[PDB]
């Protein structure tokens, strides 16, 4: 029983780490006064702005464009 | 919230200007100005002007005013 518990714990931790990495990559700290943008390929770049907060992108397609 | 401590305590400044005076004499005239910041609209101050605001303001206005008035005034 213990081995199954340890294996499940490890699997859950691995999934959690993957999620954390994904979220951080989709983040650029909007350092005070850093209005970035969100960016894709279907339309170019969304005509909407990332205000002066850490408004968020979807990864790798918004290569973090941190317009200061 | 980044309220990086905005020092309203006076941080002095001085600016000079070489001007072509009324007689086209190259007259170098100085001017010491005593500037302090406000509190009622600091949000825009830090948002736009960031942490450093006084460094972003005085020189051009002081130079232009000195140039104009000195060109108006004979030595």
3-state secondary structure A37-62: EEECCCCCEEEEECCCCCCCCCCCCC
Q: Tokens in use for B59?
A: 């020189």
Interface residue A7 vs chain B (CB under 8 A): no
Resolution in A: 22.0
Report which DSSP code applies to B32.
E
Burial class (CB in 10 A: 0-12, 13-18, 19+), B31: middle
Q: Which of B50, B52, B53 to mutate to test the interface with A (most CBs of A within 10 A)?
A: B50
> Among all residues of chain B, which has the CA nearest to that of A35?
B47
Method of structure determination:
cryo-EM
Q: Which residues of B touch A (CB under 8 A)?
A: 2, 4, 46-48, 50
The sign of the dihedral angle between the CA atoms of B1, B7, B8, B14 is negative
Is there a contact between B46 and A52 if contact means CB atoms under 8 Å apart? no
Burial of B19 (0-12, 13-18, 19+ CB in 10 A): buried
């Amino acid at each position: 029983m213990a081995a199954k518990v340890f294996e499940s714990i490890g699997k859950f931790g691995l999934a959690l780490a993957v999620a954390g990495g994904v979220v951080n990559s989709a983040l650029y700290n909007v350092d005070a006064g850093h209005r970035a943008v969100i960016f894709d390929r279907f339309r170019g770049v969304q005509d909407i702005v990332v205000g002066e907060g850490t408004h968020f992108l979807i990864p790798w397609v918004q290569k973090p464009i941190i317009f200061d | 919230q980044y309220p990086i401590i905005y020092d309203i305590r006076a941080r002095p400044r001085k600016i000079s200007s070489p001007t072509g005076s009324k007689d086209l004499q190259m007259v170098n005239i100085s001017l010491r100005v005593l500037s302090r910041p406000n509190a009622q609209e600091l949000p825009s101050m830090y948002q736009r002007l960031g942490l450093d605001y006084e460094e972003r303001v005085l020189p051009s206005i002081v130079n232009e005013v000195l140039k104009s008035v000195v060109a108006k005034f004979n030595a």
